Design a protein around this ligand. Structure first.
Ligand SMILES: *[C@@H]1O[C@H](CO)[C@@H](O)[C@H](O)[C@H]1NC(C)=O
Length: 246
C-alpha cells in the first residue's frame, strides 16, 4: 500500500505519496476526466492502509475507505483506534485484527465533531509536513483530545490533498513550515461532496451544474462554480465521491 516517510521528506516525495494514494483508490469510470470512486466495495478490499513514518521512524498505519477517502481508524504499535461510528466499527472487522487491544475514540470522525473534541476550528490548526510529523507522534501515544487535533491535520495532509491538487500544493508550500489553511482550502474541503455531485449531474446537462457551488478563492472572494470549464473542475479536483453515496 502507500508509504510516506517524513525523514527526508521534501515537496517532491510528498507529491509522490499523494499520487500513490490517488492511484491506490479504484475506479472504473471517469467523469469529465476525473476518476469516479466506486459506489461501494465489499471485504478488506474496501480499505486502503497507509504507512506513515514520523521523522524518527516510528510508524502508524491508517485505514482509508476507498470509496470516499475517509479515515476510519489507525493502528499504533499493538493498539488500534476507530471512530465512534457504525462505518468505522464495521471497518474494524477487516483491519488491525492482530492488534493486541482495540480502542474506540469517544467521537465520530467528521471534521465538525473532531473540531469540538480538539477544542478548536481547523482555521486555527497549522498544517504542513512538520504538523503531519507531529500528528503522527501524537497518535502513537493515546490522548483523545490531542488525537482529535492530530486527525484533523492528518486528514488535511492526506485525504484532502488527494481530493484536490490545490491542497496538495498548499501542503507542499508548508513542507518546512506549518501554516493554518487558507479559507479557500477550507471552502474546498467542505465543497467536495457537492462538487462531486454537481460534476456528475452535468453529464446530462451540457456540463452545466443543476445547482452552482459556492467557494472562496485564494483571497477571501466568494465565487460561484456554475459549469465544468472552471479550473476547480479542469485542474483542481482529482477524485469524485460517487453520487451513489450522497
Ligand atoms: C461557465 O464558466 C465560465 C468560467 O467559469 C463563466 O465565465 C461562464 O459565465 C459560465 N457559463 C455559463 C453559461 O454559466
Amino acid at each position: 500500500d502507500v508509504s510516506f516517510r517524513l525523514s527526508g521528506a521534501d515537496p517532491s516525495s510528498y507529491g509522490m505519496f499523494i499520487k500513490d494514494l490517488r492511484n491506490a483508490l479504484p475506479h472504473t469510470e471517469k467523469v469529465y476526466n476525473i476518476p469516479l470512486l466506486l459506489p461501494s466495495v465489499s471485504g478488506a478490499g474496501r480499505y486502503l492502509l497507509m504507512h506513515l513514518f514520523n521523522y524518527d521512524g516510528n510508524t502508524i498505519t491508517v485505514a482509508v475507505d476507498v470509496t470516499n477517502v475517509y479515515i476510519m481508524g489507525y493502528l499504533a504499535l499493538t493498539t488500534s483506534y476507530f471512530f465512534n461510528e457504525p462505518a468505522a466499527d464495521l471497518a474494524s472487522q477487516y483491519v488491525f485484527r492482530s492488534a493486541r487491544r482495540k480502542i474506540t475514540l469517544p467521537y465520530s470522525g467528521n471534521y465538525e465533531r473532531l473540531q469540538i473534541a480538539a477544542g478548536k476550528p481547523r482555521e486555527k490548526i497549522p498544517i504542513g509536513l512538520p504538523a503531519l510529523d507531529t500528528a503522527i507522534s501524537t497518535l502513537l501515544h493515546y490522548d483523545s483530545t490531542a488525537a482529535a487535533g492530530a486527525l484533523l491535520v492528518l486528514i488535511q495532509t492526506t485525504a484532502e490533498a488527494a481530493r484536490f491538487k490545490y491542497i496538495e500544493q498548499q501542503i507542499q508550500e508548508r513542507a518546512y513550515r506549518d501554516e493554518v489553511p487558507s479559507s479557500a482550502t477550507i471552502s474546498l474541503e467542505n465543497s467536495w461532496s457537492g462538487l462531486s455531485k454537481q460534476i456528475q449531474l452535468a453529464q446530462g446537462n451540457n456540463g452545466v451544474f443543476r445547482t452552482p457551488t459556492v467557494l472562496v478563492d485564494s483571497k477571501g472572494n466568494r465565487v460561484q462554480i456554475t459549469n465544468v470549464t472552471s479550473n476547480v473542475v479542469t485542474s483542481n479536483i482529482q477524485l469524485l465521491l460517487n453520487t451513489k453515496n450522497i
